[PDB]
Design a protein around this ligand. Sequence first.
Ligand SMILES: CCOC(=O)c1cc(O)c(O)c(O)c1
Length: 470
Amino acid sequence: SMSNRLIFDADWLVPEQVQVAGQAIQYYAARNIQYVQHPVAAIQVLNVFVPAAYLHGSSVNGYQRATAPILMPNTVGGYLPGPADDPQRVTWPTNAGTIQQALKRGYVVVAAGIRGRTTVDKSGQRVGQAPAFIVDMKAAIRYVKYNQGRLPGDANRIITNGTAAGGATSALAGASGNSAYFEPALTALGAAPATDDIFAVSAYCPIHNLEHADMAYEWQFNGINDWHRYQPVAGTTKNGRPKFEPVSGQLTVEEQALSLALKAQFSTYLNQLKLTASDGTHLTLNEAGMGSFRDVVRQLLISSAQTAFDQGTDIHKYAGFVVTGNQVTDLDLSAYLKSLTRMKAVPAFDQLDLTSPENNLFGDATAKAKHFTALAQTRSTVTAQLADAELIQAINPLSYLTTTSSQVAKHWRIRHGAADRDTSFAIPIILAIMLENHGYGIDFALPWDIPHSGDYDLGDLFSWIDGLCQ
Ligand SMILES: CCOC(=O)c1cc(O)c(O)c(O)c1
């Protein structure tokens, strides 16, 4: 209610400790902070964790109370609700280990709970479909910036972090700072009166650009007709972490036909983005999906392989790599993708029967799920509507990057694993190139043999953050 002034009080911080690399990391915690005045779901609270030195007038890793970066990680996956995280949390989902390491590095951590597609209110009504996820992230950022000074940390050094759907959340926060689109939702929540533009973005395998992801996926995997993925099993564990089992299939003749069309359409979509390489040449694809953009994808995988090769990793785990002497000199991209295997069927994202997590994300209070592409709406196997065009645009980080804007974070670090088949490599690559093209700082790679995952390179992530902030 209005009695919640959204004023942080350092008096709330209580001393705790956690082991990191066999040493004690002392910190202070304040949990369960209601970050808006009119919440609709219990999950909308945030936790604050502060290196202990900052309450005793001292330094960690070149930072002090007033200057420390504020890391804002999220636990969003599958566009599902992402509860407020905690270095002591063991319940799934959690990136508790990352919070522990961040505290050791001297970062203040503000871990916010975020509504997701399955969130319901006290009455059983859905209140967490798009754009709830990004509205909550923005509201949490506004709470932090409103409380600049009161909260330890530099509110002008907010760095979001997330994996997969959570990576898209982090990226969207960096892309869409102070966008007027979200103002009515934030007003209705009673968010703090502050801005929500942030300093830097960390994003692992961001599952974004959803309305073009079906095209990208088929451009990549057309010609590969068996798929392999996971679906759950039963089971009751103490950590609440969903247990999965493999399930495989083969594309129907009809799916294969749809694939060829989707792949063909990708060329036109890609070309009209007007992406450029460093020397300024347009990155394109021809009718058959070959060309300079495809060569960029290949080159990134060669770079990935070279890095691993230099480490003594056997890159011939997968097919297609040509090694001459000590150099990975080429790559048969088709052979690599065949050895990596296709994960998702066709369409991969906008399923014709409305059964995907993205279909459910785009539902609302009336409809559990919606389509978000013309193709799937036309070929729908169930009665369905298309989601609002402005909403699809609003939650895509690319929509904000047609320009060199003061509201977009200046500093980006994106990773997508070389063994991650949850979306096409083209998807994070398009984000990365668009960022560079518009003069933003972008640190990008496809790390060798890394699956769908995040937070696996903390040493390098933190070194990057420290390079920006110290
Ligand atoms: C479930 C793992 O990661 C995700 O966040 C995620 C979300 C999606 O919407 C996907 O389509 C996906 O493959 C992964």
